[PDB]
Amino acid sequence: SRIELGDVTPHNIKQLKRLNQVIFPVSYNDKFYKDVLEVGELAKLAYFNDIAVGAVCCRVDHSQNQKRLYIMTLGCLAPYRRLGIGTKMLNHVLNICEKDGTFDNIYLHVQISNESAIDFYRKFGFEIIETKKNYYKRIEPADAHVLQKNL
Numbered sequence: 001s002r003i004e005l006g007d008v009t010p011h012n013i014k015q016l017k018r019l020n021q022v023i024f025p026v027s028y029n030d031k032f033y034k035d036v037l038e039v040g041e042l043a044k045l046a047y048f049n050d051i052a053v054g055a056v057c058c059r060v061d062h063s064q065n066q067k068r069l070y071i072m073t074l075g076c077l078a079p080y081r082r083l084g085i086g087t088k089m090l091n092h093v094l095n096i097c098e099k100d101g102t103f104d105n106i107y108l109h110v111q112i113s114n115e116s117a118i119d120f121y122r123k124f125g126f127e128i129i130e131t132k133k134n135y136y137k138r139i140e141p142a143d144a145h146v147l148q149k150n151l
């Protein structure tokens with residue numbers, strides 16, 4: 001099948017909102033979707049035979065005297081998993097960081113129960129650097145690991 005990426009645009013943001021609502025256990029607010037339209041290539045949809053089935057949303061973060069890439073959401077609808085879509089999305093954002101060369105690291109939060117996501121990221125060089133107690137407020141478990149890949 002045809003598996004490729006595309007932009008998040010004002011015309012298709014409704015599809016992104018639906019994908020995130022289906023995939024993730026927490027809701028994202030209007031501000032999140034406003035911000036995704038301002039990050040350029042750091043937010044993308046993933047398509048499988050012309051239907052959007054996944055997405056990645058990141059932002060540049062200036063914290064702890066570093067320039068960091070923060071991955072906020074990265075996911076695929078369950079029927080399309082294990083087809084390389086996650087890999088394509090994550091390699092797209094790693095390619096951007098590589099071209100640039102000015103990022104110190106890439107990081108994200110992940111619920112401690114999500115073993116499969118942790119192992120997926122560990123394949124790309126991410127490591128658990130910290131565990132944030134009560135990061136999530138409405139889901140169980142509430143703890144989040146911080147995964148980081150040093151660039």
Ligand SMILES: CC(=O)SCCNC(=O)CCNC(=O)[C@H](O)C(C)(C)COP(=O)(O)OP(=O)(O)OC[C@H]1O[C@@H](n2cnc3c(N)ncnc32)[C@H](O)[C@@H]1OP(=O)(O)O
Pocket residue numbers: 023071072073074075076077080081082083084085086087088108109110114116117119120123
């Ligand atoms: C910042 C965040 O959003 S953290 C939360 C991440 N997202 C989620 O957990 C949402 C729900 N999960 C998903 O959307 C997906 O399972 C993802 C994003 C974690 C992975 O996406 P996929 O498209 O399924 O991954 P992809 O097919 O590229 O897998 C790459 C490799 O990771 C490994 N892998 C991925 N998922 C699994 C799994 N559940 N079990 C075992 N190995 C796995 C395999 O080694 C795989 O390669 P292989 O199939 O050739 O053996």
Ligand SMILES: CNC(=O)c1csc([C@@H]2C[C@H](NC(=O)[C@@H]3CC(=O)N(C)C(=O)N3)CN2C(=O)c2ccc(-c3nnn[nH]3)cc2)n1
Pocket residue numbers: 024025026027028032035071072073074109110111114135136137138139144
């Ligand atoms: C300047 N930063 C921003 O603009 C910005 C916008 S959203 C964001 C970050 C990204 C972070 N992403 C993850 O946690 C991913 C995806 C996912 O859904 N899960 C489960 C996972 O494992 N990993 C969640 N998020 C929160 O702040 C957040 C969001 C929801 C809740 C909550 N708790 N109870 N209800 N809602 C708690 C924290 N930052």
